[PDB]
């Protein structure tokens, strides 16, 4: 009675582009080209696929199968698999909140860059502004110039001292207060995501039509533009030049594994929630396969979109694309790439479509990001929740706004780096490992292959059974161990992070997964009798 069965999706293509839109984001555009160029060039294509075939694809498909088969959220699905692991469903939730504290503020920047691109004269071209220093030296200016250690460019001046305003903070110690502009921008973003989620999967499935198709159009325009630019072959050469001596280093394999894990994004509850709303007899194999292969191809062409323009930028300056692409961060897009766009005809156009591209790159992923959590919470507290969906969705959007105020500060970029590298990363890898272990070694891989045999009509191949059993947990274990054995030394904008930064990162990291061990102890501490009877009723799913 009442609710009973759940709803289902409108069309196959909507979910195929929703998952693709979540998989494709900023990192596909700029993280993959940089990490591909500096780690062997074209030879990085070899382990990126291997780490995909053996690590990424099995977790992606296994997550999409569990989601489309059991049709439960990120929390309630563990009650039906391994109750002690129900804390997993909570951990991811907390994780999302950290991600949402900064990933949206970033989009805000693009938005603030987009709404400022309606002027006939772009702000970051001249130096006669109210924010530039005496070091500001620009082009369309006397030739012969020679750059000095203290000299800066109008683009670097514009990002550093105007929008980000990072000069008003001394580091993590003193960063307050909050910039009201980026607060209003991130409010507009939380509003364009509000009307795309509040109705459920219907609006995030209608908005995905745009959020997932626009970046390919914008990338196409920037691609055919940058390919026509003189000297664009240098960036492509630096992008594809095979350096087989890099493959001997054990680092590039870990880089490929991590890159294909976060790019594929299993283990986050997004694929679980998106897969939950679907037909029972619908095929799952082809869906997962196609989606991932697009996510990689899209990264591949995005590489050209970046390196043609950076090649042109190296030609206008003096070569070694590594010199012009040293900084691996938002500065590669907001400073380097932006300064390169400013020096092209119809600059207003390529700026609007560039920043708009960024926003549409971010939107689909924040849509899904929220979709998984909302689905999980509504399914764990049903009829105590679902009374309205708009109420919960609003409480989440607003919570993320107040959670982003730390990122909206003058020293917000510092918090962005700290949260992106020291907090969320190792925890998502951890919970992905815990999920992969629970589903593969607790629920049983044989029963999983039988469930897929019931849904899809055929049992998965030996290649996939052997991947879920052994290949995937070692795939995540390698990345986790590699990070924990040597955490990278953080540096951002001529500011080295204090030595205690990792403790804060680990503090934020540890406060996220206190629920799985305290919940294992909680449920393990609640069920009476002997510990063998409690763990036997706790590992085996509910009988009826």
């Amino acid at each position, epitope marked *: 009675g009442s609710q009973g069965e759940r709803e289902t999706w409108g069309k196959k293509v909507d979910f195929l582009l929703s998952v693709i839109g979540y998989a494709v984001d900023l990192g596909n555009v700029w993280r993959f080209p940089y990490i591909c160029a500096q780690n062997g060039g074209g030879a990085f294509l070899l382990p990126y696929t291997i780490m995909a075939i053996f690590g990424g694809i099995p977790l992606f498909y296994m997550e999409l199968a569990l989601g489309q088969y059991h049709r439960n959220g990120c929390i309630s699905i563990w009650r039906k698999i391994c109750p002690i692991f129900k804390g997993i469903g909570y951990a991811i939730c907390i994780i999302a909140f950290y991600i949402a504290s900064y990933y949206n503020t970033i989009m805000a920047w693009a938005l603030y860059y987009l709404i400022s691109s309606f002027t006939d004269q772009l702000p970051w071209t001249s130096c006669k502004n109210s924010w530039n220093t005496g070091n500001c030296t620009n082009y369309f200016s006397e030739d*012969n110039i020679t750059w000095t*250690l203290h000299s800066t460019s109008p683009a670097e001046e514009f990002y550093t001292r105007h929008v980000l305003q990072i000069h008003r903070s001394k580091g993590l110690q003193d960063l307050g207060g909050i910039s009201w502009q980026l607060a209003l921008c991130i409010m507009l973003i939380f509003t364009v995501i509000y009307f795309s989620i509040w109705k459920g999967v219907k609006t995030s499935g209608k908005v995905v039509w745009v959020t997932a198709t626009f970046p390919y159009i914008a990338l196409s325009v920037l691609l055919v533009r940058g390919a026509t630019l003189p000297g664009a072959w240098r960036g492509v050469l630096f992008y594809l030049k095979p350096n087989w001596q890099k493959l001997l280093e054990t680092g590039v394999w870990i880089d490929a594994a991590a890159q294909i894990f976060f790019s594929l994004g299993p283990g986050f509850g997004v694929l679980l929630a998106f897969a939950s709303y679907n037909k029972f007899n619908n095929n799952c194999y082809q869906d997962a396969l196609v989606t991932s292969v697009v996510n990689c191809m899209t990264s591949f062409v995005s590489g050209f979109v970046i390196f043609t323009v950076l090649g042109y930028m190296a030609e206008m300056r003096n*070569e070694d694309v590594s010199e012009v692409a040293k900084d691996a961060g938002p500065s590669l897009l907001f400073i380097t790439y932006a300064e390169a766009i400013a020096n092209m005809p119809a600059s207003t156009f390529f700026a609007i479509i560039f920043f708009l591209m960024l926003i549409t790159l971010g939107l689909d992923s924040s849509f899904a990001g929220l979709e998984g959590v909302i689905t999980a919470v509504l399914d764990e507290f049903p009829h105590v929740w679902a009374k309205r969906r708009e109420r919960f969705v609003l409480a989440v959007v607003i919570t993320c706004f107040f959670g982003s105020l730390v990122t909206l500060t003058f020293g917000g970029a510092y918090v962005v780096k700290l949260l992106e590298e020291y907090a969320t990363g190792p925890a998502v890898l951890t919970v992905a490992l815990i999920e992969a272990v629970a589903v593969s070694w607790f629920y049983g891989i044989t029963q999983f292959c039988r469930d897929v045999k019931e849904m899809l009509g055929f049992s998965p191949g030996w290649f996939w059974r052997i991947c879920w059993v052994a290949i995937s947990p070692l795939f995540l274990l390698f990345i986790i161990a590699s990070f924990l054995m040597s955490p990278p030394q953080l540096r951002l904008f001529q500011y080295n992070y204090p030595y205690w930064s990792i403790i804060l990162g680990y503090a934020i990291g540890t406060s996220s997964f206190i629920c799985i061990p305290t919940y294992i102890a909680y449920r393990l501490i609640i069920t009476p009798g002997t510990f063998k009877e409690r763990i036997i009723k706790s590992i085996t799913p509910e009988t009826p």
Partner: antibody
Amino acid sequence: EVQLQQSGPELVKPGASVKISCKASGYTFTDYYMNWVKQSHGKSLEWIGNINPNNGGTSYNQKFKGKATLTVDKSSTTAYMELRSLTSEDSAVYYCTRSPVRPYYFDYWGQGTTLTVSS
Amino acid sequence: DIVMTQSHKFMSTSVGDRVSITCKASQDVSTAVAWYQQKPGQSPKLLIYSASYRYTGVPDRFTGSGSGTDFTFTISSVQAEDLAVYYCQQHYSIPRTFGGGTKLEIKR
């Protein structure tokens, strides 16, 4: 104007270490990269590495990694290059040369330092 | 790395002749070539930067040309005090490398 005064000749026994100085004047010291070029007897110039004077931001060459150590002192605007594990190949004339960031040319050089590594 | 190759280790010219030194690079350089002068017993002296541009305090008789991998340093009117060893050096990719050196001997 721009003057770079290095140290005098140095005669050091093989296996020991030697430090060469570089006093700069005539320009804003925190504005330009400080470099070290090794020139062997009858050979060509050989870029050792640079150092950022604001923070000591060193950038060595792969051929001199672990061979030369560049330091800098802002209190007196003076750069240093130290060479350890001296052999017969290190007996050469060493220069410290000013250079901007871009374009990376060596506008002003020192007079050189004749190093002789022999017992 | 980059290999700057000067084929002619020695070149003979006379006082007043037109002399040109060639410099061959490994890969494409665009216009990132500097020409240095090292007089016998003195420190190197910068003459040309970015293929063709002359530096401040250099007579007009010293020129530079080239765009790509092969570059040429040309002296129109050779003076008696122009006797020195000339070096070419790329300034785009790390590390910055130099040429072998061309000792310009004067014929009389």
